[PDB]
Amino acid sequence: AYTNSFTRGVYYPDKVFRSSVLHSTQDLFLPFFSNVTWFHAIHDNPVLPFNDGVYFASTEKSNIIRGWIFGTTLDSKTQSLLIVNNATNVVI
């Protein structure tokens, strides 16, 4: 499936306060109005490519989306990132 990202995935590029200012930057951003690969859990969650990194909106009412895995080959012949968000904590 597909949808449109619109204006989403913008983040604070640096830990520097600035205010009332039209500042400009270059960074890895989700491009405006880019295409969004809207997965579903119907009656599956495949391995995705990471590319230049990711945006991951994930509307919820169940709190069943609870973690992520990242890396090269995700198969013990590499170290690989795991994230869990179990009830209260973030655990990495």
């Binding site: 604070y12 640096d14 830990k15 520097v16 306060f17 600035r18 205010s19 200012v21």
Partner: protein
């Protein structure tokens, strides 16, 4: 107040083979760069983005200690703008490297021969075969093994975690003062402020890329840094061919400063 692990790093049992050099991140501690620089141990202490003298006054988000053994002839390669197959396949300092390179003879430690010392972009690691090794023996002088540490220093906008043994004063407000916050050196009128930093932010800025605000690193209040009072001095005079009496306009400042 934790002391940093340089006593481990510079004494660690095996420095790695330069094809696969060690990297220890250092954080959350105080560093006596003076004791390292003054140490009799080091055959070289070449520094690039900073002078080894200046280090104690300045501090860093992190420091990375890249630890390995080289043949003593190789020390050339461990610099910006220097070349070689080791310094291509399995090492490279970037050509704008911010840090120091510390090296010394290890023939007493690392010779045996010691054929473990295998060799082959900036801080790249790689694992026909492009591979070679030394075989260090106590009989080896620049053909001997040498230990090197490269300290690469991190200057991101996060709060510092590795700092020199600098001692904090109390804070002072509403008065023109010299200051240093985590290595941000300057001079100005520190005042507490209503500029609401978001919880992750650690400096505040304006058009010039000047630090218009800071958050104090021990008590997390937000300070403006307004300039010390300044302005042109103009001397009002009649002709010297009339009188030697003069009046002085201190431009824009308030008589309270003068």
């Amino acid at each position: 107040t934790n002391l940093c692990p340089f006593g481990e790093v510079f004494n660690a049992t095996r420095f790695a083979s330069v094809y696969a050099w060690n990297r220890k991140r250092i954080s959350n501690c105080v560093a006596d760069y003076s004791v390292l620089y003054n140490s009799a141990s080091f055959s070289t202490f070449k520094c690039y983005g900073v002078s080894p003298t200046k280090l104690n006054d300045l501090c860093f988000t992190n420091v990375y200690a890249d630890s390995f053994v080289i043949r003593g002839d190789e020390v050339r390669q461990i610099a910006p703008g220097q070349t070689g197959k080791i310094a291509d396949y399995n090492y490279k300092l970037p050509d704008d490297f911010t840090g120091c390179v510390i090296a010394w003879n290890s023939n007493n430690l690392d010779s045996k021969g010691n054929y473990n010392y295998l060799y082959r972009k900036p801080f790249e690691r790689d694992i026909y075969f492009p591979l070679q090794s030394y075989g260090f023996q106590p009989t080896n002088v620049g053909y001997q093994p040498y230990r090197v540490v490269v300290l690469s220093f991190e200057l991101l906008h996060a709060p510092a975690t590795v700092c020199g043994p600098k001692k904090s004063t109390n804070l002072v407000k509403n008065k023109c003062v010299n200051f240093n916050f985590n290595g941000l050196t300057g001079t100005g009128v520190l005042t507490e402020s209503n500029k609401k930093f978001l919880p992750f932010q650690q400096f505040g800025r304006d058009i010039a890329d000047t630090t218009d605000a800071v958050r104090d690193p021990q008590t997390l209040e937000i300070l403006d840094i307004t300039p010390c009072s300044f302005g042109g001095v103009s001397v009002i005079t009649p002709g010297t061919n009339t009188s030697n009496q003069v009046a002085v306009l201190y431009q824009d400042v308030n008589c309270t400063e003068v």
